Design a protein around this ligand. Structure first.
Ligand SMILES: *CCC(=O)Nc1ccc2c(-c3cccc4ncc(-c5cnn(CCN6CCOCC6)c5)nc34)cn(C)c2c1
Length: 309
């Protein structure tokens, strides 16, 4: 019977389609752009091991979704296919387009987003703000922190090689897996064709204008060079263990300040070398910023020289 049949033509790709009875839905992972994200166990996700279970994240479409929401979730999924797999991005694993509501299945990152992961690992004392976690975890070593940055840079280098511009690279858009692998999220989202509201917070209270390069702020120009600017902000987030950028600065003053040369001060626990890397990412002139290729090479060297003691 036609009950529950989509009015739309959802694209069935036999390489990726999973019968939804292979998903055992589990705990909520929060509200995404298009609907709930839910942890699930997938049976037989790898057709070579039909009797094994893999934990996955299931992106669903909310019941009151618009046609644009549906189109946007399909577009993200097809973009992930074209971009292909990398260790440091959230990868596509499958989809359910038949016999029920649309699900897009991606890799599960059990430790959640990087900002709250780092906040929960703040040690006491003078160099960081307080630890807000009631389940605090062991502090990371200096090498772990640089390694976090290296992994994100490696993921962005891959995405840039595939001509993918992220446009909102921030610690809240990096997720951390059970094995502490950093994975960039939301890289496949299509760009809004409408102008954005600079003063509208995200559902988690963030103001994305604080990650925008000046040419994105002023003229809405987004390039790989503006993603490098954002990476500089993400570096500052890492070495403040989840800090909020531009403390005390009202957002409507930000472009004026950046234009006059204002940049964030160095975090208390941050080498001169990594601060110089942040500042280079924040070159006013887009052509003068490093590339992700260069950032990867430099972070590789710095990781190797940085103590894990
Ligand atoms: C429109 C913008 C938007 O909503 N983006 C968005 C992107 C990704 C999202 C996830 C998500 C996706 C893929 C994998 C994944 N794995 C895990 C989690 C996750 C969420 N919360 N946790 C638990 C974190 N705690 C931390 C403390 O200790 C216990 C674990 C894991 N999320 C994803 C989910 N949402 C809502 C996304 C939105």
């Amino acid at each position: 019977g036609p009950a529950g049949v989509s009015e739309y033509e959802l694209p069935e790709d036999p390489r990726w389609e999973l019968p939804r009875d292979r998903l055992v839905l589990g705990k909520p992972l929060g509200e995404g752009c298009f609907g709930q994200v839910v942890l699930a166990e997938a049976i037989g996700l790898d057709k070579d091991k039909p009797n094994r279970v893999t934990k996955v994240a299931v992106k669903m479409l909310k019941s009151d979704a618009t046609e644009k929401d549906l189109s946007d979730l399909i577009s993200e999924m097809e973009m992930m296919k074209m971009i292909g797999k990398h260790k440091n991005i959230i990868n596509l694993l499958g989809a359910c387009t038949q016999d029920g509501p649309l699900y897009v299945i991606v890799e599960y990152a059990s430790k959640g987003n990087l900002r709250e992961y780092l906040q929960a690992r703040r040690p006491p004392g003078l160099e960081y703000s307080y630890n807000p976690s009631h389940n605090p975890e062991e502090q990371l070593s200096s090498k772990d922190l640089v390694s976090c940055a290296y992994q994100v840079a490696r993921g962005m280098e891959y995405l840039a090689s595939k001509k993918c511009i992220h446009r909102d690279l921030a610690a809240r858009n990096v997720l951390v897996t059970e094995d502490n692998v950093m994975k960039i999220a939301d890289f496949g989202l299509a760009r809004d064709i409408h102008h954005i509201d600079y003063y509208k917070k995200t559902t988690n209270g963030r103001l994305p204008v604080k990650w925008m390069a000046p040419e994105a702020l002023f003229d809405r120009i987004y390039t790989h060079q503006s993603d490098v600017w954002s990476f500089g902000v993400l570096l500052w987030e890492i070495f403040t263990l989840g800090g909020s950028p531009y403390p005390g600065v009202p957002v409507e003053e930000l472009f004026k300040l950046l234009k006059e040369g204002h940049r964030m001060d160095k975090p208390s626990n941050c080498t001169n070398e990594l601060y110089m890397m942040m500042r280079d990412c924040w070159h006013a002139v887009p052509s003068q910023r490093p590339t992700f290729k260069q950032l990867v090479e430099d972070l590789d060297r710095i990781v190797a020289l940085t103590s894990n003691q």
